[PDB]
Design a protein around this ligand. Structure first.
Ligand code: HEM
Ligand SMILES: O=C1O[C@H]([C@@H](O)CO)C(O)=C1O
Ligand SMILES: O=C1O[C@H]([C@@H](O)CO)C(O)=C1O
Ligand SMILES: O=C1O[C@H]([C@@H](O)CO)C(O)=C1O
Ligand SMILES: O=C1O[C@H]([C@@H](O)CO)C(O)=C1O
Ligand code: NA
Length: 250
């Protein structure tokens, strides 16, 4: 009841469904689900509830936001998706990039995240610096996810599980390596790798390790490592909330 979703035309809804089908095909065919999940996350995760600036409002199309250090490489994602976007002029970029994130999770075997259309493309990007710093710990995670975005500790741990997809690149973030042995498979393996400690061929960031040492995050890591169904349920709820920050609030 925290949300009141806007009415969109039948043509808008038809475009969402046709774009979803094109995205499912392209993301599977080009093996780019991890980059697309990262695109959706960096689009949404800049929301600050205190000023209601940032969030999933299409601003990753803006070159000034693509130039933020944290967004290195997302210009590739924007360009890869533009041929599909050109076929759907009615859709906002805001909706389109969140739809791409939902599809990325689907095509890699993850849960079905509900999608509600109607986000506006806002003219101003957020200021640089809202997204979490990979070198910091649990206090910082709570400031970014909790105080800025308004998300819970459960949401922090579940969303960190998105690192089951993809890898770090030395030219993008400067970190290098995959968290899991199956970077195109959406499962609970990130939490299992965290619990087993570091191992050759896989990466863990300090921000990932902060989940193990924090007394509230650690029981969630344990739960998700043991119970993929519980992980998928909590991930679905958290991703839905993330994708709608600042959007359709009652
Ligand atoms: C919890 C705090 C987080 C931190 C510190 C963090 C940090 C990072 C860093 C440093 C990279 C590497 C970028 C590159 O070099 O290509 C990355 C990639 C990635 N992030 Fe996270 N991230 C966080 C949360 C999230 C969330 C909430 C999601 C989605 C639910 C997410 C999804 C991804 C994915 C899928 C990739 C791989 C991209 C690819 O392979 O191209 N991350 N993240
Ligand atoms: O997830 C990703 O997809 C592309 C490429 O690997 C496949 O298109 C890319 O550069 C990513 O980081
Ligand atoms: O501020 C930043 O955000 C990303 C990542 O830590 C959050 O996803 C990163 O590489 C930074 O420079
Ligand atoms: O296609 C392009 O790639 C470079 C840059 O994004 C590479 O990182 C850029 O300026 C182009 O327009
Ligand atoms: O190794 C670790 O990294 C985080 C934090 O120190 C990062 O700043 C932490 O809780 C771990 O035990
Ligand atoms: Na994986």
């Amino acid at each position: 009841m925290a949300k009141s979703y806007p009415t969109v035309s039948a043509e808008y809804s038809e475009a969402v469904e046709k774009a979803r089908q094109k995205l499912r095909a392209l993301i599977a065919e080009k093996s780019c689900a991890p980059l697309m999940l990262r695109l959706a996350w960096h689009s949404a995760g800049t929301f600050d509830v205190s000023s209601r600036t940032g969030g999933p409002f299409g601003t990753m199309k803006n070159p000034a936001e693509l130039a933020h250090g944290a967004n290195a490489g997302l210009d590739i994602a924007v360009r890869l998706l533009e041929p599909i976007k050109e076929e759907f002029p009615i859709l906002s970029y805001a909706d389109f990039y969140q739809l791409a994130g939902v599809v990325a999770v689907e095509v890699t075997g993850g849960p079905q995240i509900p999608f509600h259309p109607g986000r506006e493309d806002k003219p101003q990007p957020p200021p640089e610096g809202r997204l979490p710093d990979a070198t910091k710990g649990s206090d910082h995670l709570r400031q970014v996810f909790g105080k800025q975005m308004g998300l819970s500790d459960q949401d922090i741990v579940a969303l960190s599980g998105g690192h089951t997809l993809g890898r770090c690149h030395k030219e993008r973030s400067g970190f290098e390596g995959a968290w899991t042995s199956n970077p195109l498979v959406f499962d609970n393996s990130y939490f299992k790798e965290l619990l087993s400690g570091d191992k050759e061929g896989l990466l863990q960031l300090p921000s990932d390790k902060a989940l193990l040492s924090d007394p509230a995050f650690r029981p969630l890591v344990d739960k998700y490592a043991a119970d993929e169904k519980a992980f998928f349920e909590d991930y679905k709820e958290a991703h839905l909330k993330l994708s709608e920050l600042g959007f359709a609030d009652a």
